[PDB]
Design an enzyme around this catalytic site. Structure first.
Site, PDB file in Angstrom:
ATOM      1  N   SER A 163      -1.955   4.016  -2.802  1.00  0.00           N
ATOM      2  CA  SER A 163      -1.016   5.129  -2.901  1.00  0.00           C
ATOM      3  C   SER A 163       0.417   4.690  -3.202  1.00  0.00           C
ATOM      4  O   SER A 163       1.248   5.545  -3.513  1.00  0.00           O
ATOM      5  CB  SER A 163      -1.085   6.076  -1.737  1.00  0.00           C
ATOM      6  OG  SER A 163      -0.677   5.467  -0.520  1.00  0.00           O
ATOM      7  N   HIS A 185       5.448   3.915  -0.275  1.00  0.00           N
ATOM      8  CA  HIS A 185       5.635   5.173  -0.986  1.00  0.00           C
ATOM      9  C   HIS A 185       7.012   5.257  -1.650  1.00  0.00           C
ATOM     10  O   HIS A 185       7.057   5.582  -2.834  1.00  0.00           O
ATOM     11  CB  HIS A 185       5.358   6.417  -0.126  1.00  0.00           C
ATOM     12  CG  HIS A 185       3.962   6.591   0.371  1.00  0.00           C
ATOM     13  ND1 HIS A 185       3.656   7.491   1.396  1.00  0.00           N
ATOM     14  CD2 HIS A 185       2.797   5.987   0.028  1.00  0.00           C
ATOM     15  CE1 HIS A 185       2.368   7.416   1.676  1.00  0.00           C
ATOM     16  NE2 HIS A 185       1.812   6.515   0.827  1.00  0.00           N
TER      17      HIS A 185
END
Lengths: 174, 5
Positions: free
Chosen positions: A109, A157
């Site tokens: 991610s 992230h």
């Protein structure tokens, strides 16, 4: 989609299967970011953290986004572009995550946040490229970040996102 | 362990 898209995706499923058989920690011990400087020349680890997933949910949600956004970059901008985005974001988002909270993390991610970032800004600055990200989604990608702040890899992230925007920028002004 | 998410 294309070869880089599927490969990655075979890579993640293979590594997940092994985590099921061996256990998370034994794959973690070999694939995680080095936790000890002694390990610093085990260069695969700077990337392999990205192949590890910690539930069916983790992997499916990640491969979904990866297939959609990675497939788009591969088809409109080519196979080499996806490789480079992937290698830089995986390296830099691991680096930041490791500083924020230590070496025990994994998943794609961080790469995916870079893909979200690259596809959005590049859709904005160079519509001629023929990739784009719907508005509804970057704001969502933004609100996924605040819930992680309050067990998400938060530095992966934001650093991923930053890498994505930067490269897109440098790619559009070109 | 943190998930990258």
């Amino acid at each position: 989609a294309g070869p880089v898209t599927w490969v990655m995706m075979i890579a993640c499923v293979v590594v997940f299967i092994a985590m099921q058989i061996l256990g998370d920690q034994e794959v973690m011990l070999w694939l995680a970011w080095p936790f000890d400087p002694t390990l610093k020349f085990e260069f695969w680890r700077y990337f392999t953290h990205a192949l590890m997933h910690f539930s069916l949910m983790h992997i499916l949600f990640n491969l979904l986004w990866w297939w959609y956004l990675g497939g788009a970059v591969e088809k409109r901008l080519g196979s080499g572009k996806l490789i480079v985005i992937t290698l830089i974001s995986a390296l830099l988002s691991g680096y930041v995550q490791q500083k924020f909270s230590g070496p025990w993390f994994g998943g794609l991610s961080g790469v995916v946040f870079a893909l979200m970032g690259y596809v959005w800004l590049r859709g904005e600055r160079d519509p001629q490229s023929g990739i784009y990200l719907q508005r509804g989604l970057i704001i969502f990608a933004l609100i996924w970040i605040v819930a992680g702040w309050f067990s998400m890899a938060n530095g992966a992230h934001i650093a991923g996102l930053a890498v994505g925007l930067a490269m897109a920028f440098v790619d559009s002004l070109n | 362990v943190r998930m990258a998410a």
